[PDB]
């Protein structure tokens, strides 16, 4: 049979989805770049590095979607903790609407 | 405002349309516009198409169309077929995981 694929090479396909995932994770509770990265890796998106997550967090700030608190993490070191602003909450809802639209149309293209 | 989500999905979709029969830029654009993606300009489509050329995923043929006007036609190469199969496998894995996230499960 076919070789068991550990599912790498997802970077390009995750463009557009990545931002939505991060906003979704932030919506659930205050979190930081290292934790967000590990959340995405454990979900199965194994190749996303911390450095990439930082760029997206910067983009989210510029979009006005997140609120930033510097404080000590539970393990010790200071972290930048992100929460959703009301605009972030609304943009997340918009993401799910657009992602649902796109999924349905891709299922038509497959059909 | 679907341009950002379509990035990294549109390549897979265009390869799929090409697999179904020999086609050209204007036709693929119209196919995608009629499907619901009305913000997509032909410039975007041709760029993916040429991106696919430089990756050896498509074979090109300049010839007269059925109606007469000459066009640059696209078919999949052996690499293009394999890439499309990989695309569907990768997309189903990603879709599965995001659906768990949406449902609150992950
Ligand atoms: Cl940090
Ligand atoms: Cl042409």
Residue numbers in the entry:
A (entry chain A): -5 to 105
B (entry chain B): 3 to 108
Text from the published report:
The LftR protein transcriptionally regulates the expression of the lmo0980 gene, which encodes a putative multidrug resistance transporter, LieAB (Listerial importer of ethidium bromide as artificial substrate), and facilitates the export of toxic chemicals from the cytoplasm to the extracellular space. LftR contains 108 residues and is expected to belong to the PadR-2 subfamily. As transcriptional regulators, PadR family members commonly contain a winged helix-turn-helix (wHTH) motif to interact with operator DNA. The apparent molecular weights of both LftR proteins were estimated to be 20–24 kDa, whereas the calculated molecular weights are ~12 kDa, indicating that LftR forms a homodimer in solution regardless of construct designs.
